[PDB]
């Protein structure tokens, strides 16, 4: 048996009021660890906060939507535990009002759209984002971070190219643009895969 | 006094199941005419059908959402009337299943997004659409067709550039792509104008 250790730790995020923020945490160990999210040592419990498990519960995403300020601004902790030990890591959420966001904060200029693809064909979700510094584009599916699937960029356009689409690819996709100023989400877009 | 005549008549549309179709009708006359929409001589009444007045009731849009097939496929009539006379014009709705749409039917590759703009500054809503033939991009605001406001194109990108934003510009915008095969709507995007 071995105590938990983190394989991914959450990083500080600065979001915008009305938007989304997500924190990602993953751990390994024997027994396999499970994760809870706390604030000031108490388990999070809020109508606008959702925890989404992955990796049989050894991965977790804390998603906050819609963001409120100052309500949601705090230090949060990801706590990984098994019967051998417990470890935590902290992270900070900042939430700006739309009238407080700096010049340069990411914008989603155009976002992904509803798509129905025939099974085994390629589906490409598209996003255009800008900011200063130029933002990184990442993708979420059903509230979780996403050779068959490629993340492409060209200038402001990001593409999530899903080759050989299969039933498991169906779900709700979001484009996320991040730079040193903060994070902005696109509206969600459903992908359906038809037989 | 003069009987109604049409200044805009609706045109046939081919939409996709789950999407939107809109028909536009406008008339003039003395007294000012008012419009009703019929099918087979009966006033439309359906949970998914909305009629939106403009021009003090002498303009009207019939909006159907979400489209169903064969349910919604029919000939419809715009009927303009005043105390001097009544005139009607007919139009057809076709609704394709997503598994029946032809190669070339318009796609909204990326669509407009939520935007908050400071009053008097420019807001630009963006859309990317493709098809064969290359589709025309039009814009709707609060379910109605939209020098201060410019409709721009560059390759697949359409921009609705709203200069000198004012409170009346706030609302729900949709990009619409149309070619000889049919019509596809973007997801809607809200514009807010803050003081
Ligand atoms: Cl994170
Ligand atoms: Cl029309």
From Swiss-Prot, chains A, B:
The disulfide bonds in this chain are 25-78, 127-175
Any idea where this protein resides? Answer: Membrane
Which superkingdom? Eukaryota
* Chain ranges of the Ig-like C2-type domain: 4-94, 106-192
- Consult the record and explain the modifications the protein receives after translation: A cleavage occurs, separating the extracellular domain from the transmembrane segment. This process called 'ectodomain shedding' is thought to be involved in receptor desensitization, signal transduction and/or membrane localization.
Assembly description: Interacts with PPFIA1, PPFIA2 and PPFIA3. Interacts (via extracellular domain) with SLITRK4 (via LRR 1 and 2 repeats). Interacts with SLITRK2; induces presynaptic differentiation. Interacts (via the second immunoglobilin domain) with IL1RAPL1 (via the first immunoglobilin domain); induces pre- and postsynaptic differentiation of neurons and synapse formation. Interacts (via the third immunoglobilin domain) with IL1RAP (via the first immunoglobilin domain); induces pre- and postsynaptic differentiation of neurons.
Its job: Can bidirectionally induce pre- and post-synaptic differentiation of neurons by mediating interaction with IL1RAP and IL1RAPL1 trans-synaptically. Involved in pre-synaptic differentiation through interaction with SLITRK2.
Assigned protein family: Belongs to the protein-tyrosine phosphatase family. Receptor class 2A subfamily.
Protein's name in the database = Receptor-type tyrosine-protein phosphatase delta
Species the sequence originates in? Homo sapiens
- List the range of the whole protein covered here: 21 to 226 of 1912
């Amino acid at each position: 048996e071995t105590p938990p250790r983190f394989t991914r730790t959450p990083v500080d995020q600065t979001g915008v009021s009305g938007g989304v923020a997500s924190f990602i945490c993953q751990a390994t160990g024997d027994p396999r660890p499970k994760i809870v999210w706390n604030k000031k040592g108490k388990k999070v419990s809020n109508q606008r906060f959702e925890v989404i498990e992955f990796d049989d519960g050894s991965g977790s995403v804390l998603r906050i939507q819609p963001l409120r300020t100052p309500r949601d601004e705090a230090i949060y902790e990801c706590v990984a535990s098994n019967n051998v030990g417990e470890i935590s890591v902290s992270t900070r959420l900042t939430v700006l009002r739309e009238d407080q966001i700096p010049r340069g904060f990411p914008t989603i200029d155009m976002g992904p759209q509803l798509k129905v693809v025939e099974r085994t064909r390629t589906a490409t979700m598209l996003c255009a984002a800008s900011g200063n510094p130029d933002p990184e584009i990442t993708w979420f599916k059903d509230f979780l971070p996403v050779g068959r699937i490629k993340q492409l960029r060209s200038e402001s356009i990001g593409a999530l190219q899903i080759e050989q689409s299969e039933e498991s690819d169906q779900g709700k996709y979001e484009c996320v643009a991040t730079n040193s100023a903060g994070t902005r989400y696109s509206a969600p877009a459903n992908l359906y895969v038809r037989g």
